[PDB]
Amino acid sequence: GSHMCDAFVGTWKLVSSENFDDYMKEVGVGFATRKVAGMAKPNMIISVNGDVITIKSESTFKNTEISFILGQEFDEVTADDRKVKSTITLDGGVLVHVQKWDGKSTTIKRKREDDKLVVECVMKGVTSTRVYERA
Ligand SMILES: COc1cnccc1-c1c(-c2ccccc2)n(CCC(=O)O)c2ccc(C3CC3)cc12
């Protein structure tokens, strides 16, 4: 039956992006990747089957898919080709995704706000906010 995470389930499309190029600079993304990545208007498809949550991104830049169980670390190859160790947890009603690689860490938090799914990507002191609405 229903879980709280079902608030995230569905098909979402990106409607606005603030400071993403600066976030990607902090992450260490190189120029050509930043330019083509920052142009993309991905769809994000989130589904839940038992204990497994799947988040897919479809765009003209890259399609990616992760499946995971909350609190259980997994390997992830990111859209910019970092190989990272990821763990995703739910804190209150916020999905918090921490990615670790090469001594560095970045946190992506996803939360519902009104009819939007707001994604906050933080690398040290730089925050990018990416807003999606239902497709
Ligand atoms: C341009 O962003 C994307 C384009 N196509 C597919 C996935 C993503 C992409 C995504 C993404 C998009 C939809 C669903 C799940 C994840 N994230 C997570 C943050 C975000 O929502 O933009 C990201 C965080 C950082 C980067 C930069 C490092 C390269 C790219 C992405």
From Swiss-Prot:
Gene designation per UniProt: FABP4
Phosphoserine: modified positions = 16
**Keyword set includes Ribosomal protein:** no
Phosphotyrosine: residues carrying this PTM: 23
**A Pfam family in this protein?**
Lipocalin
Sites of the modification N-acetylcysteine?
Answer: 5
List ligand-binding residues for a fatty acid.
Answer: 130-132
Name its cellular compartments.
Cytoplasm; Nucleus
**What does the UniProt entry state concerning the protein's domains?**
Forms a beta-barrel structure that accommodates hydrophobic ligands in its interior.
Can you name the source organism?
Answer: Homo sapiens
PANTHER family noted in UniProt: FATTY ACID BINDING PROTEIN
What this chain does, per the entry, is described as: Lipid transport protein in adipocytes. Binds both long chain fatty acids and retinoic acid. Delivers long-chain fatty acids and retinoic acid to their cognate receptors in the nucleus.
Family assignment from sequence similarity: Belongs to the calycin superfamily. Fatty-acid binding protein (FABP) family.
- SUPFAM superfamilies with a match to the protein in the record: Lipocalins
**UniProt-recorded name of the protein:** Fatty acid-binding protein, adipocyte
Q: Which CDD domains match?
A: FABP4
Recorded GO CC terms? cytoplasm; cytosol; extracellular exosome; lipid droplet; nucleus
What is an example of a GO molecular function annotated in this UniProt entry? long-chain fatty acid transmembrane transporter activity
Question: What InterPro entries does the annotation carry?
Answer: Calycin (IPR012674), Fatty_acid-bd (IPR000463), ILBP (IPR031259), Lipocln_cytosolic_FA-bd_dom (IPR000566)
Chief site of localization = cytoplasm
Give the motif span (Nuclear localization signal).
Answer: 25-35
